[PDB]
Amino acid sequence: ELKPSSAIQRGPLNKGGWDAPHALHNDGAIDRYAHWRTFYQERFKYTRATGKSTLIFLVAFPALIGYVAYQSEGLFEFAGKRRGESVTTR
Amino acid sequence: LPLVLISLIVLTISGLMIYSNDSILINKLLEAFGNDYNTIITQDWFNIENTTLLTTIGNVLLTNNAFILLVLAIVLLLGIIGPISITMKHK
Amino acid sequence: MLILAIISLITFVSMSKLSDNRAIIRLINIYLILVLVLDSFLYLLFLNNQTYTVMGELLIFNSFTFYIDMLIYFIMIVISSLYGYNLYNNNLYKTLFEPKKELIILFLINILGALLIVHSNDFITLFVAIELQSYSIYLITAIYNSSYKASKASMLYFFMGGILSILIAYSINTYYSVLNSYTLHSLDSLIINTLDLNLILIALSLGLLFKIGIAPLHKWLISIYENTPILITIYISLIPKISILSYLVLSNISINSLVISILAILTLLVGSVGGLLQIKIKRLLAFSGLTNAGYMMLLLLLNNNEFSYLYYITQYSISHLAIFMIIIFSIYYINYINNQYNPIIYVNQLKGLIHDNAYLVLSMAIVVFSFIGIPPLLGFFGKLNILMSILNNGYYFISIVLIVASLISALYYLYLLNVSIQDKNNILINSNETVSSVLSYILSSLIILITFGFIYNSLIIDIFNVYFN
Amino acid sequence: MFIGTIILVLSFLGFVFNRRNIILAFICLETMLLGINLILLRNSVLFDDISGSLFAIVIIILAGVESAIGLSLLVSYYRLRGVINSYGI
Amino acid sequence: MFLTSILLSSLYLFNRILAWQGNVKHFYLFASNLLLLFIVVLYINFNTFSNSFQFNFELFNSLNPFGLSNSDISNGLLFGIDGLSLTFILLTVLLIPLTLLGNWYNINFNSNLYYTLVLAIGLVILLNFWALDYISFYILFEATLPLLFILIHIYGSSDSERASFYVLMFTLSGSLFMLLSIVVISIVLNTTNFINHNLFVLSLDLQTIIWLGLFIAIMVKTPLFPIHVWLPVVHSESPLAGSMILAGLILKLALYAILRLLLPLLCEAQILYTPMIYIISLLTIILTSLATLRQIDLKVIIAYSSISHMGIAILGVCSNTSLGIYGSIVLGVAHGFVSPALFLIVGGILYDRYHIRIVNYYKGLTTYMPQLATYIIILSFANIGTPLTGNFTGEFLSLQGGFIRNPIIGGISCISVLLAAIYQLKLTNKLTGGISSIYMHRTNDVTIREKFIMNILIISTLIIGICPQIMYNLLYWTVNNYIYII
Amino acid sequence: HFHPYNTLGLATQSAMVGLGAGVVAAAARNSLATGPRNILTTFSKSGGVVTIFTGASIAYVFTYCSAANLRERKDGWNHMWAGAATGAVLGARTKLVPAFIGWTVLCGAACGLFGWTGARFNADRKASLEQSPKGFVQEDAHQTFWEVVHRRPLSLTVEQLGEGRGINAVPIATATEAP
Ligand SMILES: CCCCCCCCCCC(CCCCCCCCCC)(CO[C@H]1O[C@@H](CO)[C@H](O[C@@H]2O[C@@H](CO)[C@H](O)[C@@H](O)[C@@H]2O)[C@@H](O)[C@@H]1O)CO[C@H]1O[C@@H](CO)[C@H](O[C@@H]2O[C@@H](CO)[C@H](O)[C@@H](O)[C@@H]2O)[C@@H](O)[C@H]1O
Ligand SMILES: CCCCC/C=C/C/C=C/CCCCCCCC(=O)O[C@H](COC(=O)CCCCCCCCCCCCCCC)COP(=O)([O-])OCC[N+](C)(C)C
Ligand SMILES: CCCCCCCCCCCCCCCCCC(=O)OC[C@H](COP(=O)(O)OCCN)OC(=O)CCCCCCCCCCCCCCCCC
């Protein structure tokens, strides 16, 4: 007994314009491939290879470049130099 | 039954706890039980009229807390209007 | 002047017919407007935070409470215009949004009970006024009695309000058993040192707070807010929140409260992650109230919180009131009306709203980016001025949990937008009947306060500097 | 304070663990209110004032109007459904 | 009365152009082109010999809420420029008609909406560079995001929804901790200001805390390696003008915010933390430019390219050197030129015609479109760090400034010249050469409007490339300003 | 300075407390449930709650006290190590290795972020801005936390930052003077 009112007269929605003809034959294999590649993260799972790359690029490489960066803060000036002059501060 | 027993113990003891003000928790509870001293009632001849308890309630409901009697009238009004207004079925 | 309105009104409603009821509410609407306009000037009494105690250590009147009073009148002028005015002149909307005979009676008695808390100094004034407003929410819930859900919700609300009234009464009499006193004015900052009033004042605070919707006991209030119809629930959501919270913010009995701090953390957590996978709009919209009542429980821990509170109050009241008024307007555009009392429920029903009345989506967007805290809108300065009080006073883990809770709560706010700006196959091209001019002007006014209300931030603070300091 | 606290706690647990009907829940609420009364009236007698007796005589009336309101709420609940469930509302 | 009558006239003219012309896009182009004329007349009256903030105006003061305010007490929102602001404003304002140009025929359904949102985003990021409070910087810093959400969601690829979400989510989530840090500054100093704030000193234990909240927000917005995560998808599923305004202006806005907000009052903090910034900067140059090699999609490659160039850019900012600061500015402005041209080449000339962005379809674009392939190669080589283009001036002075402060971080920072060439020329030779693709049917040559946009965005790189001294007249104050060498 | 902890005493106190919380939550799980349940299904259909409370209590307080005792200072890192042990105990209930590693790392990071802000839900009274000296220094003094100055001592800059990068105990100008 509750229906939206009679004075609506709602019509269809177009997007309008010119039917651009198909400039591309889509490949089913290429489209399935690319849809698998962009949405890879919803099927990603941890394995030993994932653990190896996640260890080395997220943990080991920041720690190595970290140690190298904190050791070498005020070591080197080369600004005006001479023979027999050490360039390391330490 | 087990949550009954746990809640009996905790709610009973913790209801007995706030009558007391030592910082130590066990001293709060034992002051609940130390009541066996007998209060001494002395006769003072300072009062000349039979102000009963109901007279004093009628003096404090009516002068010092007259507004509480009047907001209470609004509450009694609501207790009339409400049950009526539910159980009418007007027309 | 609410008293004179109630005394005149119920005699007047006893003599009017059923068909007169609508027009009666129109009268009361204008009445409350001329209590704002012609009686505002009483703010001149409250210079330099001069406080009065009236009826003999019974009601305390400061200007904090005067502002709460003015806010409650403004939102009632809105809610009363929602009942008293037609949306459209159809044969449909007359049987969907129709007031009962005694509805405005319970409305004004409820506002009376909600004002006699914020103005209250005594504890028996507190208890009688909580009882008055609790009865009024009982009867406003049960007044649309030809509904299965509303009657079940009124019974549930009766028993869960009875427990938390007897917990307040037990805390008042527990406080009396250690001090022959009724006021928190007796406390005066020496007594709290040498007296273990932690457990009393905290239990009093809790028994006052669980009626708001703080989170260990939050499920029953979300059930009442989903079961009640769509007009009753924009009142019973707003009023006990602002009344009970502006009581507890005024009297500062839970400072360094570890229990209030746990329950604030737990509220911000299970409010933001509670309402995520939900499909009903009043549910979705009632867990927004749980998180935004969480941001208040933080301010209870504070000393001197009267800026952050009041600004975020009128923030939440305008934003609250506007987002409930928007989904009243979306009912014309849905393809499926069920459940005469509650005509829109599921949040996917407003799906094609941008193709039919796109500026209703502009309205909906503007209010929902203000719930998130987007800086051109008024909700952001509310969250900002809460943050300025939290970080001032040592609550550093509370602050980052506030932020994570705001980020999680933005998801189900933006779900409203996600659903609203979508494609719909069958769009409206022309409508015969249009929306009530005086009623859609209220939504336009409630937006222009949210959009262009960051203008007056400076002015308000200078006015805030004079009347509260 | 023993009689009021024991009436309050036993009535509270009888309210909470009620699964058998609804009128037991109403009467457990009223026996709670009696217990809060008892604690307060004793504190008035021990402190030599009517003050807690003032809060007592007000909460008598408020317990009354709570009964009147809520039992009309039950009649409204019963109007559409001609039986009240045993497990609850 | 005069400045109100101007607005009452111009809104009336707007309503009339609406009533008679269905689009607005003519009036929007006209307004943004007038903004160009106005800002260059402000550039003529700009005094370069003063370090000062020249054109100051207060909004939303107490004594005058609607308009300008001349009072002895100020609590509104301040606005004004030095050289350092003004450079970006120039780079801002010449970008704004071009994106309004950039979708002149693509958007068919709801024109007036899209062009209003694009112009409104451009105006907000105009006013981002005028601001002078911490709060008035931050109000407009986040005014963009509803407009970006509504723009990415309504228009885009099939995956508009997730991209609009991420541009709200990550950007918001970093900006909230930015707000935490702004609040902690505003309750200690009791003044948010871009003028006085180098004078105040904070404790080192107190600078130590404040600086994390601003720096992780700049980590989100200039996408450094821990969160560089929204950037490829919010490009790859954007429409055209949203992607151009994003990668030309929003990333440089956070490059501006690391100068304006952090380097004046976090100096004694900032020295203790330059190795952490160098960890994250080198680690976002190496590891994002290496992830470019394995990409199936085509707008996503130019997105990760933008990550690698901003990773080069920010290690000139934190270099504590005159060279590094000037190189970061010339990198930021030149990348703001060269990069929206690349998003045009993937998005305008190549998605409007074929509507699929997978790389595997596109081969041998030379033999049917010679002058497009001409563009693709000379915009490829302008991206790498091949000189006389302004991108190399930024890369070179940034790598030199990063070699000052720590030489070993500059040694592995310098291989970015190689790593930035590998993926870009690997894309360029796949697009440019081969037999023309059997999937692509032949379409139109590049039109006059697209060639117009391209010619402007390539001349404006070449002028900075041949002579970077043309904008040193703005910066020679602000290159010396942020240096802390006791 | 500090005082070492009794690992055995604090551990057995927490073990008793976790046992009590396990019994209370098992009773609350019985009484809030459906189906045929009796007095003996408290520890039968328990869902293993008493193992959760017991293991979390013992592991957190043992790792917290042991890490505080071997480091000989009390700071936010001890909460990180103890929260990692708590995440190890909570993550062994899901008998999976990458799950377990995730529970350890993320629970340890969350508990370290907790313990770094003071390890308190509520506020500290003397440490907040409102109860601490703030604003400018009135005269020259040791600038405490929450205070602003105009000029800082250069000896403090050499002591706190270092003697290296562009930073020196004498400015570069008057180090190069004609006499
Ligand atoms: C934006 C990214 C997220 C960043 C999260 C921020 C959390 C960072 C916290 C840092 C901070 C608040 C400052 C934050 C303000 C900005 C907040 C930003 C936004 C907040 C969301 C809390 O510092 C906490 O640090 C913890 C460990 O690190 C300690 O843990 C505990 O350790 C055990 C000790 O007893 C506990 O027993 C144990 O229970 C815990 O284990 C706590 O003691 C301490 O409160 C610092 O506060 C403190 O700093 C110290 C200096 O030394 C200050 O002393 C000053 O200096 C001395 C003379 O020079 C003099 O002593 C004194 O005269 C002077 O006063 C204090 O004034 C105080 O104020
Ligand atoms: C002829 C009388 C006209 C009737 C006016 C009735 C108004 C009812 C509305 C109540 C809620 C709406 C917000 C009102 C804000 C008053 C601020 C104030 O001033 O608040 C201050 C401090 O506020 C606070 O803490 C914070 C509140 C912040 C409000 C945030 C919303 C800002 C956007 C709306 C305000 C600007 C709109 C102006 C449009 C031209 C104290 O309050 P007060 O004691 O100075 O009251 C003033 C007496 N007044 C009403 C007669 C003048
Ligand atoms: C929604 C986000 C939240 C919004 C918060 C911020 C609201 C901004 C509202 C826009 C209005 C700001 C722009 C207009 C104000 C400046 C007008 C002006 O008159 O500037 C005065 C200034 C000096 O003038 P004066 O001191 O009086 O002396 C004159 C001597 N010949 O003269 C000058 O120095 C020249 C000033 C040039 C200003 C250039 C600004 C570029 C952008 C202009 C359009 C801004 C509209 C943006 C709309 C989107 C909203 C962000």
Automatic annotation (TrEMBL), chain A:
A GO term for molecular function: oxidoreductase activity
E.C. no:
1.6.99.3
Question: Does the record carry Membrane as a key word?
Answer: yes
Q: Looking at the record's lineage, which domain of life comes first?
A: Eukaryota
Q: Which UniProt keywords apply?
A: Membrane, Oxidoreductase, Transmembrane, Transmembrane helix
Q: Residue ranges of region Disordered?
A: 1-19
Transmembrane segment boundaries: 53-70
Q: Which principal EC class is assigned to this enzyme?
A: oxidoreductase
Protein name per Swiss-Prot or TrEMBL = NUVM protein
Q: Which organism is it from?
A: Yarrowia lipolytica (Candida lipolytica)
Lineage, please?
Eukaryota, Fungi, Dikarya, Ascomycota, Saccharomycotina
UniProtKB/TrEMBL annotation, chain C:
Record-annotated NADH:quinone oxidoreductase/Mrp antiporter transmembrane domain positions: 120-409
One Pfam annotation reads Proton_antipo_M
GO cellular component terms, alphabetically, are:
membrane
Keywords, in A-Z order: Membrane, Mitochondrion, Oxidoreductase, Transmembrane, Transmembrane helix
Query: EC number(s) of the enzyme?
Result: 7.1.1.2
Q: Which domain of life is it from?
A: Eukaryota
Q: Which reaction does it catalyse?
A: a ubiquinone + NADH + 5 H(+)(in) = a ubiquinol + NAD(+) + 4 H(+)(out)
Q: Where in the cell is the protein located?
A: Membrane
Q: Which InterPro entries match?
A: ND/Mrp_TM
Oxidoreductase: present as a keyword of the record? yes
Per the record, residues carrying N-formylmethionine are 1
Protein topology in the membrane: Multi-pass membrane protein
Q: What are the TM regions of this chain, as residue ranges?
A: 28-47, 59-83, 103-130, 156-178, 190-210, 230-249, 255-277, 284-303, 309-337, 358-382, 394-417, 438-461
Provide the GO MF annotations for this entry.
Answer: NADH dehydrogenase (ubiquinone) activity; oxidoreductase activity
Family per similarity comment: Belongs to the complex I subunit 2 family.
**Protein's name according to its UniProt entry:** NADH-ubiquinone oxidoreductase chain 2
Q: Which organism is it from?
A: Yarrowia lipolytica
Higher taxonomy:
Eukaryota, Fungi, Dikarya, Ascomycota, Saccharomycotina
Originating gene: nad2
UniProtKB/TrEMBL annotation, chain E:
EC assignment: 7.1.1.2
Give all residue intervals belonging to the NADH:quinone oxidoreductase/Mrp antiporter transmembrane domain.
Answer: 131-410
Q: Cite the Pfam families for this sequence.
A: Proton_antipo_M
Catalyses: a ubiquinone + NADH + 5 H(+)(in) = a ubiquinol + NAD(+) + 4 H(+)(out)
Chief location of this protein within or outside the cell: membrane
Give the sites modified to N-formylmethionine: 1
The protein's name in its UniProt record: NADH-ubiquinone oxidoreductase chain 4
What species is this protein from? Yarrowia lipolytica (Candida lipolytica)
From TrEMBL, chain F:
Q: Which InterPro entries match?
A: NDUFA11
TM ranges: none
Location within or outside the cell: Mitochondrion inner membrane
Give a yes or no for keyword Ligase in this entry.
no
Major localization listed first in the record, in broad terms? mitochondrion
Its Gene Ontology biological processes? mitochondrial electron transport, NADH to ubiquinone
Q: How does it sit in the membrane?
A: Multi-pass membrane protein
The protein's UniProt keywords, in alphabetical order, are: Membrane, Mitochondrion, Mitochondrion inner membrane, Transmembrane, Transmembrane helix
Example GO CC term: the record gives: mitochondrial inner membrane
Which PANTHER family does the entry mention?
Answer: NADH DEHYDROGENASE [UBIQUINONE] 1 ALPHA SUBCOMPLEX SUBUNIT 11, NADH-UBIQUINONE OXIDOREDUCTASE SUBUNIT
Q: Which domain of life is it from?
A: Eukaryota
Q: What is this protein called?
A: Uncharacterized protein
